[PDB]
Paper text:
Here, we expand upon our prior work and demonstrate that one such 200 kV microscope, the Talos Arctica, equipped with a K2 DED is capable of determining structures of macromolecules to as high as ∼1.7 Å resolution. At these resolutions, water molecules, coordinated ions, defined backbone features, and holes in aromatic and proline residues can be clearly distinguished in the reconstructions. Our work demonstrates that a modern 200 kV counterpart to the Titan Krios (i.e. a constant-power two-condenser lens TEM with an autoloader) equipped with a DED can produce SPA cryo-EM reconstructions of ideal biological specimens to resolutions better than 2 Å.
To further complement our studies as well as those performed using 300 kV TEMs, we sought to investigate the resolution limits of our instrumentation using a more conformationally homogeneous and symmetric test specimen. We thereby selected mouse heavy-chain apoferritin, a ∼505 kDa complex with octahedral symmetry. Movies of vitrified apoferritin were collected at 73,000x magnification using a Talos Arctica TEM equipped with a K2 Summit DED. The majority of collected images contained a single layer of apoferritin particles in a pseudo-lattice arrangement, indicating the molecules were embedded in a thin layer of vitreous ice. Reference-free two-dimensional (2D) classification and iterative rounds of 3D refinement and CTF refinement (per-particle defocus, global astigmatism, beam tilt) with octahedral (O) symmetry applied yielded a ∼2.2 Å reconstruction, and Bayesian particle polishing improved the resolution to ∼2.0 Å. When we used these optimized instrument values (0.562 Å/pixel, Cs = 2.80 mm) to reprocess the entire dataset of particles, we were able to further improve the resolution of apoferritin to a global resolution of ∼1.8 Å. The anti-symmetrical aberration plot of the apoferritin data also revealed some beam tilt and axial coma, but again no significant trefoil astigmatism. However, the resulting aberration-corrected apoferritin reconstructions using Cs values refined from 2.70 mm or 2.80 mm were very similar both in terms of resolution (∼1.78 Å and ∼1.75 Å, respectively) and quality, suggesting that tetrafoil and errors in Cs may have been compensated for by other symmetrical (possibly even higher-order) aberrations. Inspection of the ∼1.75 Å reconstruction revealed defined backbone carbonyl groups, clear density for ordered water molecules and coordinated zinc atoms, as well as distinct side-chain structural details such as holes in aromatic rings and notably greater density associated with sulfur atoms, all of which attest to the quality of the map. Local resolution estimation of the reconstruction revealed a fairly uniform resolution distribution, with the core of the ferritin shell resolved to ∼1.6 Å.
Numbering used by the authors:
A (entry chain R), D (entry chain J): 4 to 177
B (entry chain A), C (entry chain C), E (entry chain B), F (entry chain E): 4 to 176
The structure:
């Protein structure tokens, strides 16, 4: 029998929120893997490491916000395994930025499908939640990553040895 | 060929550190599940939720410290799936504290086996690392959880309705 | 049946901790006796009295830390009589410093045997506890006492009347 | 031959002061035992533990004040064994408060006999010392302990599980 | 006849501490040589010079800490000649970082042998001293040097003329 | 071929500066040995130890200033072994002060020969450098040491047991 607070919250939306929680946790774990990679002594880009660690924590925050939403609407959180990232070795700062861009666009696509579903179920609170706390942030993150990829490519990374070093210092070091 | 920094770091220790990283991440995810449970409208113990969320973040910090150790010694981090917790529904504040106590003692046991291995491989830096940043913290956490279980039991939880409410306010608030 | 928190804590270690608690309490009582002695009107060295009173309180703190350890690991504290010091009359500042040096080295030896036992039982938390909070402090205290004995002897104490007076003022004041 | 400072200080008073020093040390050790008991993981009342630890330190201070008195009057301190407390296991917060009340009243009785002796020996400095620094403090401590016993009993301790917990928080947690 | 403070301190440990003191002094002198090299007008990398001068002073501090340990345990310090570094001319910032990495790993190896010896002699105070003040610092220094070597190599040093200049400004400045 | 900055700097001056660098380093090591000696538990004069440790660091600073001069004038620093001090055991505070006085006067004599050489080679910058940063400091140090020797002797050291103790407290404290 439904939660005492549950109103206008379709079971399909509940399931899709649980899937999105898992995806945010997965993204957090991918960024954590990237951060570990740039901390290796044979890579040693401290500001790449800092950048992706920050991203990892932000993705965890996103997941926790979705869990709060789920309880607030009277849904029930069902956690699933967090799959390991597709790679141990991220090959270069440029490659990691490109993979992060791909990841962020996949997360964005999942959010857009979630918003489609909430619109189809006439759930304006959920639509507004997604728009307010997620869509704008994704567009910003995607644009940032695209900018970084563009600059790294123009500087000549990975092959120009100086490029990732100086990008680490100037763009990611403030 | 070995990392330029690698010295006196046995492949067995490297593997065991990777396993411990996974275990800390798993513990973080268990505590996150508990925290979500006490945020439910039909449970609604805000300070239980806060407590376990804090524990979740601390476990993530422990994992990140182990990853830093791994890179510092020239090992290579290999991540694995983080398995889902054994339960969605943690049944009561007392039950969650008991499960957390069990979890912390399993993590402690894994750390003790890691210290055994480092001692067997004559790796004093790793032994000292475990002693300094892990063993003492585990003993403290286990003692705290035991205390909470004891008080909850004596108050009459879960069946005495007032017990978890007042414990939430007094001890965890 | 064992405490809910007890893990990897051997009954022999528990017993040895209780013995060490008693020894620390005994040391506290010895230093208290010394302090009383230098407060006598026919001795009247106020800074010797202060020094040994400080040592007495520090030894009590050491005992209380061991009791906390015992409860933290799930052992049970069993107190015993605190025997009276071997002497009422400590004869001179030099003699008291020499007796304190002997006492501190006996306490150190007991701690070293405790660390041996913890190592034999593969109890790294207890080993680390002893190393961290006890061994270093003992080495420091022993060195300090040795220094004081050396200076007092060189100054000509007890027989040079000025020596303990000036040592009281300069070193201990 | 007597101390150069000794005046109007009877050997019987000196002996009785040494006995009182031992009793204060014993009381300190009893309270230390109680404090250890409430720190056990299967008891776990932190404010009971704090309370009795405070009492233990206060009893040690009382003993040290008596030792100072002894040297001030030119008596000589003779220490004796400090006997172990009668119990390892203090059974409950109520039981420990009751045992502490009994202990404090025994210490008070010893102080009253000491004051009787000082009065019989016409030693007004010692009488005043006892009155000023000891008797009033004992009456206060006894009244406090009686109050705590009364409240614990009325709350239903030990059998009402909530009683010692809430007393720990409200009365002893200030 | 032994020092009044000496307890549980084996003659082999005393000798090994004296050898380690000499090694730390030697390391200090090597880093001083490197620092002088980067101050040459035909090299002129001020932040390399600063970096290695800092390292030189830190190595001297390490030696002085070992001397304090030696006196604290009642051993006797016997100094030996400090041999001159193997090179006057360190060839480049990358080469100096590589030689420093090699040096730090040799010092680490000597510390590990010292810890082995202290463990074999059952000297927990000395083991803890080494772990606490030396091993962790060495692992950190080795990791740092490895990082610097990695970055310099990737930037194209020594042959890319800009590399050491910009590394001097960004990483070491 | 000469350094681009080298002007009016004779090869003999360069060699003599390298010798002086070695002598300053040697002096630093002698004072370090003295400092260690007064830290022994059977000597235990803390302010003698502090005093000579300060002197050791000052001598190292002198050496580093000479190395800077060498690079500034375009000479090349060639380091040599730093020989061990002539003694492990400095026997007493008075004896150590006397040996320090002898050492400082030998360093002064070497500086005077260096100034003679610079004057003979018509190198006014080097002459001024020696006068400004070295000669005056040496005269001051020699006078100070002479004062300390005089007072220690008059107090009756080493044989008057109180003398070095009180000198440690009053003059060096």
């Amino acid at each position: 029998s439904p939660s005492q607070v549950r109103q206008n919250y379709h079971q399909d939306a509940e399931a899709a929120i649980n899937r999105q929680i898992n995806l945010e946790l997965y993204a957090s774990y991918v960024y954590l893997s990237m951060s570990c990679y740039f901390d290796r002594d044979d890579v040693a880009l401290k500001n790449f490491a800092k950048y992706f660690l920050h991203q990892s924590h932000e993705e965890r925050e996103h997941a926790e916000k979705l869990m709060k939403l789920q309880n607030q609407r009277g849904g029930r959180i069902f956690l699933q395994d967090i799959k390991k990232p597709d790679r141990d070795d991220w090959e270069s700062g440029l490659n990691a930025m490109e993979c992060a861009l791909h990841l962020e666009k996949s997360v964005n696509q999942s959010l857009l499908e979630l918003h489609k579903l909430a619109t189809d179920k006439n759930d304006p609170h959920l639509c507004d939640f997604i728009e307010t706390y997620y869509l704008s942030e994704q567009v910003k993150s995607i644009k940032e990553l695209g900018d970084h990829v563009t600059n790294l490519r123009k500087m000549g990374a990975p092959e120009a040895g100086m490029a990732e070093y100086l990008f680490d210092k100037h763009t990611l070091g403030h």
